Amino acid sequence: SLFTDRATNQLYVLLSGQLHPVYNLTSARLVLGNPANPATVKSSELSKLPMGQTVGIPGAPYATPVSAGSTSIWTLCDTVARADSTSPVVQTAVIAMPLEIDASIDPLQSHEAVLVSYQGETWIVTTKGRHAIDLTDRALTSSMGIPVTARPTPISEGMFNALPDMGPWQLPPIPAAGAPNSLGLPDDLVIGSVFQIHTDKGPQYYVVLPDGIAQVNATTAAALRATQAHGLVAPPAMVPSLVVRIAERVYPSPLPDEPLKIVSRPQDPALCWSWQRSAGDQSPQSTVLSGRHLPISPSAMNMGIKQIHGTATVYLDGGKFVALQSPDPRYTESMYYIDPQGVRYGVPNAETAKSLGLSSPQNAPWEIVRLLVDGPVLSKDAALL
Ligand code: NI
Ligand code: NI
Ligand code: NI
Ligand code: NI
């Protein structure tokens, strides 16, 4: 049984005939094994049983309330101040609540990108994640859509970890570039060369590979030729007749169809990685946002909770109960209760979760969730000391 003293609101749990003071309702439920609510009694009634030692986990949350919303939404945002200066400052926000997206803060379009720095190296950020880039040769990076005037701005450790590494911002290497083609094409069209065919939609460019030909967009055709033209002043025009017979392959160039547009960080200081998964979805969806401020409502902007011994300001609409999957380094499933102040507390297993009254956890991304300051693990074993 579980009692609350009417005079003091103090909790007591009855264990093996002794009343034990207990620090919080969370701890009481861990020791009882079910999400009990206290029975109110007059203070003097508690004198009728022998009093034992205090039990529970002092740093646990008082209880474990969770917010109604079923869709799991987690967003990490970097905001940079003094972006052009010698000393930019980055702030990071963790947002676990629905967003309000608009033209001032929205997903990067397929031809938009952000140039950033982290630990002395440079990366291109697109909708998909981050891509290594070497700014040593700016003629080369120009042909890959980066203007010579573009300068990187810093990202946070948290943002670097959250953005998936999608591979380098470069043309895929072509093995045997310069060697004669084995496809029956004219001798000038060596491996790694570009040609075109006229279509009703205009020119279609192709690159010659060891094992076939691959369609490339105009931007990629230009970048190929900028790096190595193989002696050709322009892509030779071939007839469909000669080409349709050749094996078609894929050439996985990262370059978008439209000329790349590089985001001005002084104008658009906010960069976010947004993740979401709804009940019953097979996989989550994520995207990168860019814009003027956090993707939250006018009034939500004032509700942030700074984690002083943490790294982020947290924006939450109530508690959360989440499941993570991470390679630590072996594949590990873990659960956390998140209190309404953004503190995460481990929940070791489903039996323990259910004793606390925490029904199915929501899948969430460890890259964002583990940025939250961690409190004590909520375990019966800890509670019973
Ligand atoms: Ni005892
Ligand atoms: Ni706005
Ligand atoms: Ni936009
Ligand atoms: Ni556009």
Residue numbers in the entry: 74 to 458
Question: Can you quote the paper on this entry?
Answer:
The ESX-1 type VII secretion system is an important determinant of virulence in pathogenic mycobacteria, including Mycobacterium tuberculosis. This complicated molecular machine secretes folded proteins through the mycobacterial cell envelope to subvert the host immune response. All ESX gene clusters contain at least three or four ESX conserved components (Ecc), named EccB, EccC, and EccD, with EccE being present in all ESX systems with the exception of ESX-4. In this study we report the molecular structures of the periplasmic domain of EccB1 and the cytoplasmic domain of EccD1 from the ESX-1 cluster.
M. tuberculosis EccB1 (Rv3869) is a 51 kDa protein containing a 40 amino acid (aa) N-terminal domain followed by a single membrane-spanning helix and a ~400 aa C-terminal fold. In order to gain further insight into the role of EccB1 within the ESX machinery we determined the crystal structure of the C-terminal domains of EccB1 from M. tuberculosis (EccB1mt) to 1.7 Å resolution and of the orthologous protein (MSMEG_0060; EccB1ms) from the nonpathogenic mycobacterial species M. smegmatis to 3.07 Å resolution. Both EccB1 structures contain a single elongated fold in the shape of a distorted propeller, which has an unanticipated quasi 2-fold symmetry. The central core domain consists of a 6 stranded β-sheet with 5 strands (β7-β19-β18-β5-β6) arranged in anti-parallel fashion with an additional strand (β21) parallel to strand β6 on the periphery of the sheet; the sheet is further stabilized by a disulfide bond between the two central strands (β5 and β18) of the sheet formed between Cys150 and Cys345 (EccB1mt) and Cys152 and Cys347 (EccB1ms). The four repeat domains each contain a 4 stranded β sheet and two α helices. Repeat 1 (R1) (residues S74-M124) and repeat 4 (R4) (residues G391-L445) are located between the core domain and the N-terminal transmembrane region while repeat 2 (R2) (residues E185-P241) and repeat 3 (R3) (residues V267-A320) are located on the opposite side of the core domain distal to the transmembrane region. The interfaces between R1/R4 and R2/R3 domains are formed by hydrophobic residues on the N-terminal helices of each repeat that fold together with each other and with hydrophobic residues from the proline rich strands downstream of each repeat’s C-terminal helix. The R2 and R3 domains also pack tightly with the core domain via residues on their N-terminal helices as well as β sheet residues. Pairwise sequence alignments of the repeats shows that R2, R3, and R4 show 26, 33 and 27 % sequence identity, respectively, to R1. The elongated shape and continuous hydrophobic core of EccB1 suggest that it may serve a structural role – perhaps forming part of a structure that spans the inner and outer membrane components of the ESX secretion system.
